[model samples]
Target: MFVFEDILKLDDRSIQLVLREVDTRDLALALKGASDELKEKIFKNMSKRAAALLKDELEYMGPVRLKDVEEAQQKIINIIRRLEEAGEI
Candidate 1:
């Protein structure tokens, strides 16, 4: 019954509910294959020199695992959630 993914999408309605509500903040991201929306929001927090290491970490990684990817997002989301809980935007 939980539609958590809906909150994650950041569509117009979600944007109104989310971004419109957010004011100031810091964020942080990784490399290729994430959504445009994902990249837009994330890279805003990253320094170009701050990235490129995720590749070094996963360059030899074989067939991508959805579970692993899913966990990764949640890890990041957890960080973001803590930031929001701290009253940022």
Candidate 2:
């Protein structure tokens, strides 16, 4: 995909598979400036308990650098690319 938001085009099963590989902080950081649609897509694929924790963390998150958020997003996108390469998504 050309960009991180391209991930939204992935099917639910693929999203779930990708989500399984990311830690909470990285996901949360990547989501800092994310769209509602993308956020919904991610949360919809998550367990409600884990989703709640992420919501809470995002709600209470402190100021983070844009560089950090971009890094986190890149990390997640790379995971998706790798998973696709491995034929796991």
lDDT of 1 by residue, 1-89 (tens): 22224334544443333433322211111223366666665434434644354334455554565555565545545554655578652
Cα RMSD for candidates in order: 8.0, 1.3
Candidate 2 residues lying further than 4 Å off, grouped into runs, are none
- TM-scores for the candidates: 0.48, 0.91
lDDT string, candidate 2, 1-89, tens digits: 35888988999999988888899899999988689999888888899799888988888888889998999999988898899789886
Q: Ten consecutive residues with minimal summed lDDT in candidate 2?
A: 1-10
What's the lDDT of the predicted structure labeled candidate 1? 0.42
Model 1 stretches with alpha carbons more than 4 Å out? 1-33
